[PDB]
From a paper:
The redox-responding transcription factor PpsR (photopigment suppression) from Rhodobacter sphaeroides is such a multi-PAS domain-containing protein. PpsR possesses three PAS domains (designated N-domain, PAS1 and PAS2) and a highly conserved glutamine-rich linker (Q-linker) as well as a C-terminal helix–turn–helix (HTH) DNA-binding motif. PpsR acts as a repressor of photosynthesis and tetrapyrrole-biosynthesis gene expression by binding to palindromic DNA sequences (TGTc-N10-gACA) present in the promoter region of PpsR-regulated genes. Additionally, the function of PpsR is regulated in a blue-light- and oxygen-dependent manner by the antirepressor AppA that, together with PpsR and its cognate DNA, is able to form a light-sensitive ternary AppA–PpsR2–DNA complex.
Phases for PpsRN-Q-PAS1 were obtained by MR using the PpsRQ-PAS1 dimer as a search model. Since the dimer arrangement of the PAS1 domain was virtually identical in both crystal forms, we obtained excellent phases and could model the remaining parts of the Q-linker and the N-domain into the electron-density map. The PpsRN-Q-PAS1 dimer has a barbell-like quaternary structure with a protomer crossing along a central imperfect dyad axis. Owing to the protomer crossing, the N-­domain and PAS1 domain of a single protomer are located on opposite sides of the dyad axis. The functional relevance of the observed dimer architecture is supported by a large number of contacts, which lead to a total BSA of 6180 Å2. The PpsRN-Q-PAS1 structure also allowed the identification of an additional PAS domain in the N-terminal part of PpsR, which was predicted based on sequence information from some PpsR homologues. The PAS core is N-­terminally flanked by a helix (αN), which again corresponds to a classical PAS N-cap and constitutes a central part of the N-domain dimer interface, in analogy to the N-cap of PAS1. The highly conserved Q-linkers form a ∼57 Å long coiled-coil-like structure which connects the N-domain dimers to the PAS1 dimers. However, neither tailing nor a reduction in the elution volume of the eluting peak was observed during PpsRN-Q-PAS1 purification, suggesting that PpsRN-Q-PAS1 is not able to form tetramers even at high concentrations. Additionally, the observed PpsRN-Q-PAS1 dimer organization appears to resemble a general architecture for the connection of PAS modules with a variety of effector or sensory domains.
Residue numbers in the entry:
A (entry chain B): 6 to 91, 98 to 257
B (entry chain A): 8 to 257
Write the structure that this text describes.
Amino acid sequence: SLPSLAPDLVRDLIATAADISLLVSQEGVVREVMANPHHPSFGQLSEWEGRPLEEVLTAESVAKFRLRSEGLEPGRGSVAVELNHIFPIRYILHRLPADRSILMLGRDLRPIAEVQQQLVAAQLAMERDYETQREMETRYRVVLDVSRDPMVLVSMSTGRIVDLNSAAGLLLGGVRQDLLGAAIAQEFEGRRRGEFMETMTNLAATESAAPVEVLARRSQKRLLVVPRVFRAAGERLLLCQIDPAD
Amino acid sequence: PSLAPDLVRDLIATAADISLLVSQEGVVREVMANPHHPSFGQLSEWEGRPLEEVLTAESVAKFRLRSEGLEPGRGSVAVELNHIDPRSFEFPIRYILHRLPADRSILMLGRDLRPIAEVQQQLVAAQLAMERDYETQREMETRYRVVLDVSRDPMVLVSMSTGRIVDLNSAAGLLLGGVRQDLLGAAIAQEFEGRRRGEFMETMTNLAATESAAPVEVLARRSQKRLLVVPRVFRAAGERLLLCQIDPAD
């Protein structure tokens, strides 16, 4: 249990547990301000002393203080109320027995309000990144799908079709679901994964050289394939434009 | 103002969110709850047991360093500590330590850090979500840029909101008679003789909605070429994109 505590130490304990503490007379005048020597900001509230508590509360807080305080009788009890100064504060109120004065023990709510504000910013940032990602995905789909230039997108490591448009589908002789994930070499008669990917890669590396001549299995069309290599998110992709050769 | 010992305990228990009284030898002597502050659970079982039992390893060391030099009447020290509750869940408290003169016990006055840690955990989670969404945008943007630029189909992307060009490829640049640098940001309607933003954007939106093969015939100002424009409209993330497909008319 708590041993005996000198008045000076009791004042210091209270002042340090609370962020801001007020002694207020029965008349409603701020008799003493005790601010936490550890807690930031406060301490310029020297000026609050001698002045009406109502002078440092919003309209809404005054009425609220009045209501919750009128009932408060001096004894074993306390009551809690959130108030706003000219910043938000949780006060626990005690009425002292000798002169009906009110001791208000304040817990500063600015730190929690501050992190909430950050969370609000965080959440708006996520909305922005999500919308912008969807906007880019849509531009990508739109440009690729509407384009009359037959194009196929191929993964350099797997040799598989990762995307294409319907114009490529027509020239290749297949529908989207057949062609997505299909090994590109295997769509052309006589080609195999190894040598075909090496051909495209070498081709893509020189601007002056002709396209590759292939025969599409499904459509039985001779086609000219023109490959371009680029990096997307680290990964190497081949973008091939295809034309009828005959 | 002078105060009786019982009220003094009550003032101190209600000024802190939670407070502990620890003997000089390190045994928890009292856990004082603040009845107006949100519950920490039943922590009364801490009483009569060592403080070291209820702190993480790092906090034990930290409490040692902060408190050991602390003298009575010689001020107080702030320290943030991680507790481990009887159910093995951790919770953070910022304490102010005083050493009491009568017996050299330590009175620890706590501010609850749970709501701050909770929000901070949400902030870290949000960063992670943003990062994943950013990387995905880079992939899409890279693909979009290469596809648009490589495509021989002449295309101009127009903002529905402003009627200004937001992108195009060089096949479109050639037909319009301009370089990228001059066309980006430019009002699309003003590229074409006798056309105006309001009527032109309306015509494009209405035609797109009709799903028609009939183009708009226009005369490009810079190149003086007769062109055929087929619009399509796409909606993403609460705004619209007008895609103009362009062909020479002759």
